[PDB]
């Protein structure tokens, strides 16, 4: 019936239950101190009993907590987040939704209409990019980067698990930025060598990320503009991590053809980012995440379908083009291809 | 796994998909014009194609719309809302969540802490009730009442379906206000007679609601304060519709004992409102609806469990105490009892 409307019609409230449990330390409480009674919870969090009962009904109905014989535990998802070392990441991301995303999401309608970021009315400035606007509010700059680091840390396992890194030798990371993915990649695969190709400005951060990891031997940098300049030869594999999502389809063909001439015959290209399902029915994560991308940043980020991306690789001349859609909950994956010999 | 986090972590966005489809007329469009292609939708709504694709992915992932061979229909829930004549009610309620509830919900945390309505910071005033604060913003007064009328219209069927109204003769509606429930009740049950017991102020609205329906014969009014004054005798059944939810448990016992002395032996008391499940695990509607009740109004509304209410009826001397929990999606029901002979 209409029951499916409930988590949507009250969706903003559903979020607030998670937001609250995070800010008031409920989930951490239930993690450290096992089963606790409503009254024990109410005490530990210094909340009016009425308030605690309400919060606990919220969190329990959502499956964020369970209640057995008067005692409250974390539910399956929150339980798992702790077990897998994800809690600080999940807490930080929820804090991001609270302080950055929540209020501007109310400008989705106007953003869809005007095709611009209508939500930026909540962050007055004269400049034309999100962080500068955010930096005008004390606290938000720091949170913005903490959030971005958290989001990345949610996805980066699926990149490292990609089987191609146990067969390629020299990887060219296009727009590799702060080398964090490059370092991680190099640690997980010791014989592998990685070149971070990016703008001079970003590479100063990259040489420090590389240095701290003491990987100055296997992880090099190469100053270039990924569009105008040409790519260094002798690379076995070309990687675009979160690159193809801000460019026009034709601009993506330019980059991929650049990957094709640069990579060695037999070589691989790997496109790693978030993908929409080909039938455009999901996945829900991507679908709901677009509200942020539609409402806040000035630059339009697009999540292309797997099939879209597969098509570009073929237009650029790659063969053995296919996809790697591994579980689980995030919509991140890899589209891949080879240059022939 | 963590998949259950998605509709919660992005819950505010999930709401925005419904909000958008309502404001831009998508669901009405898909209702009137059958299956439409993304491009046809994009055209009719005057949206950038990018915008329409995003909205449609949102709505389709949520099950609000379905897509078959390039053509979009309304999904099961939205389909049903139209079929059952509920669309204007659902549209109005969604408009309520958009303009009144959404932004203050971000003050849930502070509301739980302070036990007061922290969300009212968004509606500056010197007075101490919600509507006055809302009336200071042009448009909101009118929307507030339109919303309230819509919410009521969602629940009032479950009251009328209550079997007791085919066996009682004279009903005393305690705090019956604008007689809308009294009129409806009288129309659906022609032999029934109804007395609206309320404050003189409310009864002036009630005599007009009664008059328009030309039911001045079967629907009377009786000026009283439900706490200090006494109740008129000769009534077969005493009704509290949405009454027990703003009072302290002891204040509810006072009202119910008043119901007991006033009702005739053999008579019924009917408590009709929204109920929390006894195990406090739901229902989700009630659980998420509390964010509004915690953040905006100055008066604390409580949704008591069925068992709580059943207990009060017993403390007031009623027998044959039980509950009527009929489907479907709203948490509204009836707790009932009899005075013995």
Author numbering:
A (entry chain A), B (entry chain A): 4 to 344
Which lines from the publication concern this structure?
The Streptosporangium sibiricum SibL (Ss-SibL) protein belongs to the S-adenosylmethionine-dependent methyltransferase (SAM-dependent MTase) family. It transfers a methyl group from S-adenosyl-l-methionine (SAM) to 3-hydroxykynurenine (3-HK) to produce S-adenosyl-l-homocysteine (SAH) and 3-hydroxy 4-methyl-kynurenine (3-H4MK). 3-H4MK is the key intermediate needed to synthesize pyrrolo- benzodiazepine (PBD) antitumor antibiotics, including sibiromycin and anthramycin, in Streptomycetes123. Two monomers are tightly intertwined head-to-head, with ~23% total solvent accessible area buried in the dimer interface.
The apo form structure was then solved by molecular replacement. Each ligand-bound subunit of Ss-SibL showed a similar and robust architecture in its peptide backbone, whereas a 2.1 Å r.m.s.d. in the 294 Cα positions was seen in the unbound structure, indicating a considerable conformational rearrangement upon ligand binding. Superposition of apo form and binary complex structures indicates a rotation of the C-terminal domain of approximately 22° toward the N-terminal domain36. Upon cofactor binding, the shifted Tyr134 is probably ionized and ready for catalysis. The three structures also reveal an open-to-closed conformational change induced by the cofactor, which is required for formation of the substrate-binding site. Based on these observations, a step-wise reaction of SibL can be proposed in which cofactor binding first brings the two domains close together to complete substrate-binding site formation.
